[PDB]
Amino acid sequence: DKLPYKVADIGLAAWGRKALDIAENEMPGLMRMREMYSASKPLKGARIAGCLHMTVETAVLIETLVALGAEVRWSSCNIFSTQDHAAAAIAKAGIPVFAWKGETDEEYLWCIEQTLHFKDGPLNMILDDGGDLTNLIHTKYPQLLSGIRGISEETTTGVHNLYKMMSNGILKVPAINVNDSVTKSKFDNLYGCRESLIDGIKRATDVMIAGKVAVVAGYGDVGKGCAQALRGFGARVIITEIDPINALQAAMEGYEVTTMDEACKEGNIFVTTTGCVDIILGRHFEQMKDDAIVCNIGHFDVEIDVKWLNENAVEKVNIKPQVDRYWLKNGRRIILLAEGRLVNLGCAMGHPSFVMSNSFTNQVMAQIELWTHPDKYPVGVHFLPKKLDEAVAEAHLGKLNVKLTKLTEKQAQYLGMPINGPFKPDHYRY
Amino acid sequence: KLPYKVADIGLAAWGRKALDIAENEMPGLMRMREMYSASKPLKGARIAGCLHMTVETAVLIETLVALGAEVRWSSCNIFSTQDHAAAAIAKAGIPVFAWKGETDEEYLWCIEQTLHFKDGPLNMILDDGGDLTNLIHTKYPQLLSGIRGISEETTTGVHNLYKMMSNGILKVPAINVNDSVTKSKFDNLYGCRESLIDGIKRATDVMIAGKVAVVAGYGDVGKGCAQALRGFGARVIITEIDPINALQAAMEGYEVTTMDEACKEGNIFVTTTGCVDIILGRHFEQMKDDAIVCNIGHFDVEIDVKWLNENAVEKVNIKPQVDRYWLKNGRRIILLAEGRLVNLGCAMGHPSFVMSNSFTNQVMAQIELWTHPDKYPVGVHFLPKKLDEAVAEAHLGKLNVKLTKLTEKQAQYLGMPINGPFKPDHYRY
Amino acid sequence: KLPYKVADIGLAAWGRKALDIAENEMPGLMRMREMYSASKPLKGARIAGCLHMTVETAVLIETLVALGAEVRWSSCNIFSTQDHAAAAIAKAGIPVFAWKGETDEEYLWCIEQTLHFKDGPLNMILDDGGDLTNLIHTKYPQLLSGIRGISEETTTGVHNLYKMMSNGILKVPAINVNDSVTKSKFDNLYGCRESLIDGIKRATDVMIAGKVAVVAGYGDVGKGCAQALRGFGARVIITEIDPINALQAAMEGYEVTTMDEACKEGNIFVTTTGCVDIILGRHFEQMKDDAIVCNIGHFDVEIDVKWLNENAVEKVNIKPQVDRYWLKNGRRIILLAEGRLVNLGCAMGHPSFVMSNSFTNQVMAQIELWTHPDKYPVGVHFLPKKLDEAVAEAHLGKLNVKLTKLTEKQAQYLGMPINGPFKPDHYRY
Amino acid sequence: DKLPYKVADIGLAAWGRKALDIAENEMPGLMRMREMYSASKPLKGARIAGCLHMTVETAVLIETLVALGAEVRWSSCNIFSTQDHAAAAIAKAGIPVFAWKGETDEEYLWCIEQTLHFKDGPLNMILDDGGDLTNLIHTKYPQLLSGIRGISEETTTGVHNLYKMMSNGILKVPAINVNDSVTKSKFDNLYGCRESLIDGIKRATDVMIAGKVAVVAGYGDVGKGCAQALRGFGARVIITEIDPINALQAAMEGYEVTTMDEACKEGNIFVTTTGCVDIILGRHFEQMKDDAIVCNIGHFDVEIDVKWLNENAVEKVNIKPQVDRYWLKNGRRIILLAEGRLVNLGCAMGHPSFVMSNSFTNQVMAQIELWTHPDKYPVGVHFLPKKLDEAVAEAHLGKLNVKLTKLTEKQAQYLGMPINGPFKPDHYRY
Ligand SMILES: NC(=O)c1ccc[n+]([C@@H]2O[C@H](COP(=O)([O-])OP(=O)(O)OC[C@H]3O[C@@H](n4cnc5c(N)ncnc54)[C@H](O)[C@@H]3O)[C@@H](O)[C@H]2O)c1
Ligand SMILES: NC(=O)c1ccc[n+]([C@@H]2O[C@H](COP(=O)([O-])OP(=O)(O)OC[C@H]3O[C@@H](n4cnc5c(N)ncnc54)[C@H](O)[C@@H]3O)[C@@H](O)[C@H]2O)c1
Ligand SMILES: NC(=O)c1ccc[n+]([C@@H]2O[C@H](COP(=O)([O-])OP(=O)(O)OC[C@H]3O[C@@H](n4cnc5c(N)ncnc54)[C@H](O)[C@@H]3O)[C@@H](O)[C@H]2O)c1
Ligand SMILES: NC(=O)c1ccc[n+]([C@@H]2O[C@H](COP(=O)([O-])OP(=O)(O)OC[C@H]3O[C@@H](n4cnc5c(N)ncnc54)[C@H](O)[C@@H]3O)[C@@H](O)[C@H]2O)c1
Ligand SMILES: NC(=O)c1ncn([C@@H]2O[C@H](CO)[C@@H](O)[C@H]2O)n1
Ligand SMILES: NC(=O)c1ncn([C@@H]2O[C@H](CO)[C@@H](O)[C@H]2O)n1
Ligand SMILES: NC(=O)c1ncn([C@@H]2O[C@H](CO)[C@@H](O)[C@H]2O)n1
Ligand SMILES: NC(=O)c1ncn([C@@H]2O[C@H](CO)[C@@H](O)[C@H]2O)n1
Numbered sequence A, D: 001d002k003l004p005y006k007v008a009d010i011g012l013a014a015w016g017r018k019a020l021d022i023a024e025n026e027m028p029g030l031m032r033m034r035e036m037y038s039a040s041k042p043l044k045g046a047r048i049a050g051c052l053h054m055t056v057e058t059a060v061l062i063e064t065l066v067a068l069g070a071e072v073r074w075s076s077c078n079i080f081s082t083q084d085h086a087a088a089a090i091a092k093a094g095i096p097v098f099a100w101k102g103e104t105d106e107e108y109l110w111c112i113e114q115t116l117h118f119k120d121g122p123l124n125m126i127l128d129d130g131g132d133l134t135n136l137i138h139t140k141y142p143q144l145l146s147g148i149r150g151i152s153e154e155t156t157t158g159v160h161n162l163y164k165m166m167s168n169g170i171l172k173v174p175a176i177n178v179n180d181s182v183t184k185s186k187f188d189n190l191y192g193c194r195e196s197l198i199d200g201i202k203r204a205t206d207v208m209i210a211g212k213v214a215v216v217a218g219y220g221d222v223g224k225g226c227a228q229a230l231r232g233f234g235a236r237v238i239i240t241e242i243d244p245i246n247a248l249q250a251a252m253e254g255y256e257v258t259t260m261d262e263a264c265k266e267g268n269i270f271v272t273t274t275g276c277v278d279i280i281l282g283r284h285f286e287q288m289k290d291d292a293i294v295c296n297i298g299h300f301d302v303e304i305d306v307k308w309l310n311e312n313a314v315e316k317v318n319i320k321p322q323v324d325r326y327w328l329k330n331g332r333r334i335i336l337l338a339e340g341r342l343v344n345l346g347c348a349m350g351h352p353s354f355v356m357s358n359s360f361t362n363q364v365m366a367q368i369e370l371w372t373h374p375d376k377y378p379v380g381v382h383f384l385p386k387k388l389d390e391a392v393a394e395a396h397l398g399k400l401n402v403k404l405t406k407l408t409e410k411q412a413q414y415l416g417m418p419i420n421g422p423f424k425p426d427h428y429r430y
Numbered sequence B, C: 001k002l003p004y005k006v007a008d009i010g011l012a013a014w015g016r017k018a019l020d021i022a023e024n025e026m027p028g029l030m031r032m033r034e035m036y037s038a039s040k041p042l043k044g045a046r047i048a049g050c051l052h053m054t055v056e057t058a059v060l061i062e063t064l065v066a067l068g069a070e071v072r073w074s075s076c077n078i079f080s081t082q083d084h085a086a087a088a089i090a091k092a093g094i095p096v097f098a099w100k101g102e103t104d105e106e107y108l109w110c111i112e113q114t115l116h117f118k119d120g121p122l123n124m125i126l127d128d129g130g131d132l133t134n135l136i137h138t139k140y141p142q143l144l145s146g147i148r149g150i151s152e153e154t155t156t157g158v159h160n161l162y163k164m165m166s167n168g169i170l171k172v173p174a175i176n177v178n179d180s181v182t183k184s185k186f187d188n189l190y191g192c193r194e195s196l197i198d199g200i201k202r203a204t205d206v207m208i209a210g211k212v213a214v215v216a217g218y219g220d221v222g223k224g225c226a227q228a229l230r231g232f233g234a235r236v237i238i239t240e241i242d243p244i245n246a247l248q249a250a251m252e253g254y255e256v257t258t259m260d261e262a263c264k265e266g267n268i269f270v271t272t273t274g275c276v277d278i279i280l281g282r283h284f285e286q287m288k289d290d291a292i293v294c295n296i297g298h299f300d301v302e303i304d305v306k307w308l309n310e311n312a313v314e315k316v317n318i319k320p321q322v323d324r325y326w327l328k329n330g331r332r333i334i335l336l337a338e339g340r341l342v343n344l345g346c347a348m349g350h351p352s353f354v355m356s357n358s359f360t361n362q363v364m365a366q367i368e369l370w371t372h373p374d375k376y377p378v379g380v381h382f383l384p385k386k387l388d389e390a391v392a393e394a395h396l397g398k399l400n401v402k403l404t405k406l407t408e409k410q411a412q413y414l415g416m417p418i419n420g421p422f423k424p425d426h427y428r429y
Helices: A010-024 A028-037 A056-067 A084-092 A105-113 A132-140 A142-147 A156-167 A188-205 A221-232 A244-252 A306-312 A343-347 A353-372 A386-397 A409-415 B009-023 B027-036 B055-066 B083-091 B104-113 B131-139 B141-146 B155-166 B187-204 B220-231 B243-251 B305-311 B352-371 B385-399 B408-414 C009-023 C027-036 C055-066 C083-091 C104-113 C131-139 C141-146 C155-166 C187-204 C220-231 C243-251 C305-311 C352-371 C385-399 C408-414 D010-024 D028-037 D056-067 D084-092 D105-113 D132-140 D142-147 D156-167 D188-205 D221-232 D244-252 D306-312 D343-347 D353-372 D386-397 D409-415
Strands: A047-051 A071-075 A125-128 A150-153 A175-177 A213-217 A236-240 A269-272 A292-296 A315-320 A323-327 A333-337 B046-050 B070-074 B124-127 B149-152 B174-176 B212-216 B235-239 B268-271 B291-295 B314-319 B322-326 B332-336 C046-050 C070-074 C124-127 C149-152 C174-176 C212-216 C235-239 C268-271 C291-295 C314-319 C322-326 C332-336 D047-051 D071-075 D125-128 D150-153 D175-177 D213-217 D236-240 D269-272 D292-296 D315-320 D323-327 D333-337
Touching (some): A010 A056, A010 A084, A010 B314, A028 A056, A028 A353, A028 A386, A047 A056, A047 A132, A056 A071, A056 A084, A105 A132, A125 A132, A125 A353, A132 A142, A175 A353, A188 A221, A188 A343, A188 A353, A188 B187, A213 A221, A221 A236, A221 A244, A221 B220, A292 A343, A306 A333, A315 B009, A386 D244, B009 B055, B009 B083, B027 B055, B027 B352, B027 B385, B046 B055, B046 B131, B055 B070, B055 B352, B070 B104, B104 B131, B124 B352, B131 B141, B131 B155, B149 B155, B149 B352, B155 B174, B174 B352, B187 B220, B187 B291, B187 B332, B212 B220, B220 B235, B220 B243, B220 B268, B243 C385, B305 B332, B352 B385, B385 C243, C009 C083, C027 C055, C027 C352, C027 C385, C046 C055, C046 C131, C055 C070, C055 C083, C055 C352, C104 C131, C124 C131, C124 C352, C131 C141, C131 C155, C149 C155, C149 C352, C174 C352, C187 C352, C212 C220, C220 C243, C220 D221, C305 C332, C352 C385, D010 D056, D010 D084, D028 D056, D028 D353, D047 D056, D047 D132, D056 D071, D056 D084, D056 D353, D105 D132, D125 D132, D125 D353, D132 D142, D150 D156, D150 D353, D156 D175, D175 D353, D188 D292, D188 D333, D188 D343, D188 D353, D221 D236, D221 D244, D221 D269, D306 D333, D333 D343
Parallel strands (some): A047 A125, A125 A150, A150 A175, A213 A236, A269 A292, A292 A333, B046 B070, B046 B124, B149 B174, B212 B235, B212 B268, B268 B291, B291 B332, C046 C070, C046 C124, C124 C149, C149 C174, C212 C235, C212 C268, C268 C291, C291 C332, D047 D071, D047 D125, D125 D150, D150 D175, D213 D236, D213 D269, D292 D333
Antiparallel strands (some): A323 A333, B314 B322, B322 B332, C314 C322, D315 D323, D323 D333
């Protein structure tokens, strides 16, 4: 007596399928997983609850998991990130999906709850992005924990939470940290944001980047890509940081590194990338240039104090969906994107398919590892082996017409490594 | 007769909000309003405009009206109208005939609606690409003697004016706005550096990083396009006919080769030449699977779209202005905006700040021609450097740029007028 | 009289090896030799040259001689001579009066040695910065009627020629070589992009990454300098008097402010203005400890070196052309090349490939003035675009650039001559 | 009856001292070690044999070790890298140093042998760059191993050798891998090469970079910096790689990735960064463009087959020290820099002082850790703790006028980290 799916408009499915066809041809990693494993069906018996942005890219991931034998039920991990034509295509394919663009907070929680119960029993695998599904099970459904073989987690904030859960004795299910595969963190977080930040800002505002001062809070993988994107279009980028190593990197790349207390007086565009609370506050907003654009690409909605704007502005003018222009008591305006929620996914289409093929090939590999080799994965947080990490990269080289060199026997002996790798030590930072 | 013709007048409120935001990004145009709204230098002008009907152009239109002109408007491209901007203009009582997705015949009908005002025929032309200019000269020559001047926005349009003049067929004075320094070195370069990728992304959501991109032409537009693609991690290959532009591209680290070679390597193709026959059937047949092909230069003639329509074995419309073709060789080609300007057809054109440079020049040109016509005999003219410098200066405050002033000692040393102009007429910036 | 005067003729063999390497990087000059060595268009010319006596200039000198000229040479800067290049020229029998580290009086003596040949006084000038031009006009006016033409290398020199002409005091026709497209947009820009950092590094070995660098001026030289510093991870701040150049710098992501503000922040200061009084005592007094200060523009007047010498409390010579001053405030300033051109004074100037563009223009200018003087009345002239394009084309093969040729259909469409020139005279590239 | 030092010309000492004074003011990390530890003298009793490029930067390191109480004896680890004025200043200061620019291979070995015996006994600490000192002791002087408390090793190839020695049971002394401190590998190897490669090429050849094709073999930290430097000056850079992850990084940065077998036909400049043998061979040289410039910035002299040039060229013309122009049987010329040895140190001045202050502050810290806390360091290869790594970066922020943000108590609680760090997990790649 439960809904089979819930999406904005299943009639968008034909357009969705065209977008999926294009994406498949950009995602050789996922297509190789299908070629290699569609017959052997390694995920047979798996019942995967997924909580991850319901985008065209994610649809390709979902169909890969199903091709490999899994049953899947899906929700988005963000109220604005669903692409309704992708959700429609997945629903039309008979896969239970509960996701649409513009969910309320109540609807969001309800959608996750729809993914827990399958025909043959409760979920036995978690594929998570940000840990909401992980946390829901541990907090509200502890009786389901014993039946879950593994968790794979997509993003930096999610994995931070898993390590904290483990250190405090709260984690009860083995997890693979997908974020920190080399082929995820050094590609998705960096090159993905380098394209999708600007895409979000532009679709929302059509603002010129050239000539502006842009303030980027944080200089981790996300901040590095955001800063590079903005600099490339001729913004002058100012960085804030708490970590002296990341701060020194930023200075050595030619960026001014200062505090938000100083930078708020100069920025025309503000991007938060920190995964931390209380980055942009009332005292900052009051000092900003007129029509400063403020957005978050890090986590949830707490980097920016959106509550302060709602409480203190004279008026909030909605410009269009996910774009609000606040008029402050000082007579100046602030343009806030996506209510302070992820701007690339909320105001544009998130990362492009090619780089998401890296991240999602790691996801499929992690699901196969946890489902088929559980003995290798005790309760705790684990990485994929370097050999598989390398294999993700190798699967994407052909599409780019990259010609990789093979070591000669003489060179392999000289270096003391195998011809087929792995080629780097475990601590290598790339 | 119709007061206007637009897609949906109900879009006017949203249009107005977008115009409000754009005004705050366009200090040059707002300064023209501050300076000239009382004195109304364009009183008596009846300006027919043919220029992409975007949010940015709406700000220009309302500036012309604030300065006392009567205006009637059409777009210069069948896909470039932003319907909310058109609706806001219509709602404000200004005759505009423009919508996204015109037929070719509707396009001409729209230009024709701009020619006659209550008080008489048009007496000024504001053009982008020469269609209004050519229409009057070829079909309505009886209207020419009543037109005081033409201002022309874009490289292809000004090329046509110079050709008309050399052939003795130009009959109205024109100002070349494209070749103001503050237009050509800003709009054509930095505008395309942002809006090319915006068009490609909204249309395809393709990853740029890791791709080979082939840019045909390395003029102002090609320079901006190449820099954009390289910034996102594409490997950019350039084609050129001019050895100077070619050497520039080589000295910036780009491979410069022919399209006959580059067609085998590119994943993304962008034409920027203003020339016919850049991408042909023999090129399409060699392209990598799902190569994305688009034009940012002129009209629809850089890419042989006719060839694709006639020779593909499948053609699937993905969404408006995005078509995916399957060739006999089994490979696919993705064509944007039917080969028409991709930045305006698949996205929103250049952002407002840089359009404020171009459009401040347009307002200055209209004022010069309308109020000082004897300074402009039949022929093609530039705005004075002093005015060109003034356009730039008007945008410095928004960016918090602090300009240095020469001391009297330094001005004497340089033999330079202390308030400019600061460069000789041949200076290339 | 002396056959030459150089530091050490024993350096000639090493000089010749360096010239051999440079010739293979200078296809424009080598092409001039291939085309004109038999016909000897410069037969009868007696060229006095005043231009940095470097390896690159040695290739130019031997090209002029190959084309039939007699030549006598001096450097235009007291620190820019490369002694091995000077020795190779001297060994080849060419009168050259140049060494690194001349006194100001020796500098003038060297120019004076170039004026008289066996067959009579000079009849052509090849100048860089106007010193030879000014010397003749002011001290040897009786020689003017015997001089057929002047070609001038650099922005400051051509500025002086235009001033002379407007004041009615220029008495010999001149060609402005600086403002060939293939000179100004290449040498001034890409040359400085490499040779500024070479000068700073050889002098100081300072890390660029992490520093704030202040570049005064954003013309061709300032653009090249700023890009170089940014590429290595310096944060670059720009000063400018021209609102157009200022807006360019802002649109490229640089902070544009005054020297009065920037002096408090910079670790490296580079002057590129061609103007007096850019860095003054009030600036030095505010600078970060061990700020490195240098000039790449003109003469020694951009930086107030007199102020440092008079006001520092300590001055220590680190090595040739590097001085470290201690100010009364206890902080240190490092001054390069006594405020003279840092790229030529502390390193080797621009690399040979880009100098081949500049120097091919110089050879073309000398040929034009010597063989077609009636085309050049007294005044300041440009080389024709056709020749400018030819300079670029002559360098494409070395870089393996493949230039596209228009089809006859395309040339008709564009109304363009199929072999060029391809751009109108106002084109800015 | 042994020499007290051996240098090119001790009369260069006054110029050397001026260069050292300038460098000190660029090296706040080393100067902070002096401020903090010159009175307590933590290295008292240490007798450190050092084998590391005898440059101005290294002189500042040497004087720091002596200020901290160590006795030191020094040699260079490269026959061309010594800066004779720096060596003179160290000799004049009474420190035994055996180093000059342009040593023969025999003289090189002799110089290392001079650093082993002190007045009060044999060395009891090793500071090494490339492992020659480490290998000499293990192979020729095993009886000295028991008296050595620790090894600190500077460079990637050196540390590779230490791990191999450990895996084969040959390492008998505890070692700290300095190369893989974050503040070394991500700064020295990357930003150092980004400046010093071009400096070497320019001083040797004065070649224009703009317009050229440059081929960079390897895209690790060194290759990344070299490629960026060359691209910045307008070369078109082609990368070769054996590792699919590094290769994908290069492609995503806009470089063509192909094999040397293809790239040798196109390159005008060749830079080897691999640490591997047999990168540029006869079959490559024969296909190169006329006057191709060929150089190595990786390891020793075996990346480039210099022996092939010597055996097969028609003639070798010496242009000036460390620059040779070979005329081949095909009539074309090859310009080889520094006989295939490190081009940045051999043809220029190596990395600038500021970034060497990061590397050498790690060296001082490693010497203090091994000398004063030996119980923490069993036989094996170890990293410096992240807290010290962060402290190296923090010590350089003031010179750059960087303003680092401090977490609030609320933020530190939210993130679950200490206000004073460390701020990243052990696996973080920066
Ligand atoms: N929107 C997306 O598509 C996307 C993609 C990847 C990751 N993410 C999210 O982005 C965020 C950042 O991810 P990351 O991988 O870059 O993590 P990271 O740990 O590499 O970088 C975060 C940086 O923020 C800095 N920081 C923390 N608090 C700060 C403060 N108060 N002020 C200034 N700097 C501060 C840290 O020192 C760190 O260097 C995470 O929330 C992650 O889940 C989003
Ligand atoms: N979409 C836009 O927003 C936008 C903006 C500005 C200009 N434009 C248009 O873009 C086009 C280019 O303008 P521009 O200012 O760069 O002009 P330009 O003259 O500076 O550059 C065009 C270049 O194309 C080269 N070229 C010509 N034919 C060629 C061919 N067959 N193959 C390779 N190269 C060839 C020329 O040598 C020239 O360097 C024009 O049509 C102009 O109207 C469009
Ligand atoms: N060292 C070299 O190898 C080399 C090479 C080429 C040119 N030059 C010399 O470099 C200088 C600059 O040449 P260019 O071609 O760039 O000329 P330019 O005219 O293009 O640029 C100089 C810029 O300085 C700006 N300026 C003038 N006075 C200023 C001041 N007080 N403060 C800030 N900005 C100011 C001007 O607005 C102008 O934009 C000239 O002296 C020229 O002869 C040297
Ligand atoms: N000259 C200097 O100042 C300097 C500075 C730092 C490091 N180094 C040295 O530079 C070298 C590289 O150091 P790194 O830190 O970049 O190491 P790295 O391991 O990060 O990079 C080396 C790269 O070379 C690649 N490689 C190996 N064999 C190859 C082959 N046959 N063809 C193509 N690519 C190949 C590897 O895949 C790797 O990515 C080492 O020898 C190191 O000791 C020199
Ligand atoms: N197009 C997409 O589906 C997309 N774009 C970005 N992300 C993921 O969103 C996560 C943040 O929630 C990041 O870790 C990315 O991997 N997914
Ligand atoms: N946003 C806009 O209205 C816009 N964007 C680009 N262009 C103009 O379109 C012309 C090409 O028709 C160029 O010359 C630009 O000036 N207009
Ligand atoms: N290597 C060289 O001989 C060299 N380098 C730079 N310049 C010239 O020096 C002039 C400044 O005097 C500039 O216009 C350059 O053309 N010459
Ligand atoms: N200026 C210098 O002393 C210098 N420059 C580079 N390197 C070191 O040289 C090692 C290679 O032998 C690298 O790991 C660098 O840390 N030292």
